């Protein structure tokens, strides 16, 4: 039995795709997260699940693997023939394999393809378009590995409650993308209020958390609907690098964004209207330049931190600019005076 299941720990941990909900037996413990860890979509995007959900899955599975009552059973993470659920569930167990079983992304993906099962559906973006850029499960696992490699997260210290608190629009709609360096959020409004259920936040709402977390600088990329004075008077620096919603940034805007961030001491809070497309795109440019993430790796990492980031042509833009951005990184490092 378990025909076509994917083995992750010899005779102990498996991943299965099942038409119907199975029943745990005296030998096999079955569990699914398809209805527990649910992606919140903007449009037709369906994943990857965010970093807090990865964390919650890993906690859940580690507990099952330490349970005495389950110690003599095979543990089987199962998902359905809903390919959008299945892709997220495969991403979750693959991410567990990378983070906790010390597998490479390629080894984890090999196990995911080991059984007799169809391929995994790639993740799409949050735009109205028909899908044009395939973000694969392997891409996401590569992004997890790179984020781990460069210390962009640490599940020994990750605070999932706080992540899931501040991601909500009533609490500021923000996520850290690079700890101590980049915070992404939706653009503040002139007056704090609640308009048609949807709460709006003024610049001053953010002053406490920013000050407490060494946020020194705000970069705005969308239309002005508040005075930059409101931040600068509070001691923050503020920069305007506007480009059209849904567009790709010019060479000039990229160079200026990078100049700002490279000459900035503390953390930088970046926003557009939603804090997803324009914001994710420019942050990715910096991370590609200075950490040599590939386009797929950074699109994965930023979406795992902040779902819906990097939209439509911005995806292909990052792929088309990768070689250039890596070269700009080499040139940047060739001028340093360190050691």
């Amino acid at each position: 039995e378990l025909i076509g299941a994917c083995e992750f720990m010899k005779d102990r941990l498996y991943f299965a795709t099942l038409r119907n909900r199975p029943k745990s037996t005296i030998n096999i413990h079955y569990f699914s997260i398809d209805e527990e860890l649910v992606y919140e979509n903007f449009y037709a995007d369906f994943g990857p699940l965010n970093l807090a959900m990865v964390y919650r899955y890993c906690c859940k599975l580690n507990k099952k693997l330490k349970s005495y009552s389950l110690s003599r059973k095979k543990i089987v993470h199962y998902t359905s023939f809903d390919q959008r659920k299945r892709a997220n569930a495969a991403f979750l167990i693959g991410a567990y394999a990378v983070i906790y079983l010390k597998k490479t992304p390629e080894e984890a993906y090999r196990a995911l393809l080991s059984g007799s099962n169809p391929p995994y559906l790639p993740f799409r973006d949050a735009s109205f378009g028909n899908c044009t850029y395939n973000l694969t499960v392997l891409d996401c696992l590569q992004g997890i590995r790179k984020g781990l490699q460069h210390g962009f997260f640490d599940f020994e210290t990750f605070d999932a409650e706080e992540y899931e608190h501040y991601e909500r629009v009533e609490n500021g709609d923000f996520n850290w993308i690079v700890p101590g360096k980049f915070l992404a959020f939706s653009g503040p409004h002139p007056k704090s209020k609640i308009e048609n259920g949807y709460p709006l936040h003024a610049p001053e709402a953010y002053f406490p958390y920013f000050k407490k977390n060494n946020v020194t600088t705000i970069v705005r990329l969308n239309k002005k609907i508040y005075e930059a004075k409101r931040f600068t008077d509070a001691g923050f620096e503020h920069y305007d690098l506007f480009f059209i919603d849904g567009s790709t940034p010019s060479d000039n805007i990229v160079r200026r964004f990078l100049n700002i961030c490279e000459n900035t001491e503390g953390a930088i809070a970046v926003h557009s209207k939603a804090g997803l497309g324009r914001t994710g795109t420019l942050i990715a440019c910096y991370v590609m330049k200075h950490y040599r993430f590939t386009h797929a790796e950074i699109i994965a990492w930023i979406r795992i931190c902040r779902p819906g980031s990097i939209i439509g042509p911005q995806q292909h833009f990052l792929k088309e600019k990768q070689a250039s951005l890596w070269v700009q990184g080499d040139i940047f490092r060739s001028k340093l005076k360190n050691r």
């Binding site: 449009y43 109205f128 969308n222 849904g246 939603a274 997803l276 497309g277």
Partner: peptide, 4 residues
């Protein structure tokens, strides 16, 4: 093309 940011969501709304």
């Amino acid at each position: 093309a940011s969501p709304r």
